[PDB]
Design a protein that fits this description.
part of a larger assembly; 3 chains; little secondary structure; 1 helix; 0% strand; Spike protein S1 (chain C)
Chain lengths: 50, 49, 49
């Protein structure tokens, strides 16, 4: 794919086999003042390997 | 002249396809070019035979 | 294009006729940027065919 995470955070190879599961965690993992426990990266010297 | 054929792709140069188009479908495009030129070579081989 | 490809401060970025991975690698003559505002119901219409 092509994105912020698909380049510098998490990559998937073309021969990847498996499943991806998604669920809404807005009722549990969210906070009224904001949840800052989860963070993401935006800057790197080169592309991150899968 | 068979090297000038696009075979339904966007370019006749595989380097241009590799440096121009996204790899997850560029592999399919290169496979299509490979099998088209393979069919052309098979036709030439049968004609030569 | 790192503000468009490497970084995504915008909601949705999509490339149809060109590879989004090599946007900094492709080299072109000029670009005609069309800027306009479309409601969320009709933003899917910005695609060929």
């Amino acid at each position: 794919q092509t994105g912020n995470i698909a380049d510098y955070n998490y990559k998937l190879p073309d021969d990847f086999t498996g499943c991806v599961i998604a669920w809404n965690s807005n009722k549990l993992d969210s906070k009224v003042s904001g949840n800052y426990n989860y963070l993401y990266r935006l800057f790197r010297k080169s592309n991150l390997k899968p | 002249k068979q090297l000038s054929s696009k075979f339904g792709a966007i370019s006749s140069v595989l380097n241009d396809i590799f440096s121009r188009l996204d790899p997850p479908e560029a592999e399919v495009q290169i496979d299509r070019l490979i099998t088209g030129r393979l069919q052309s070579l098979q036709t030439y081989v049968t004609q030569q035979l | 294009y790192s503000v468009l490809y490497n970084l995504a401060p915008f909601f949705t970025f999509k490339c149809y006729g060109v590879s989004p991975t090599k946007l900094n690698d492709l080299c072109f003559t000029n670009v005609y940027a069309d800027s306009f505002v479309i409601r969320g119901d009709e933003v899917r219409q910005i695609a060929p065919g």
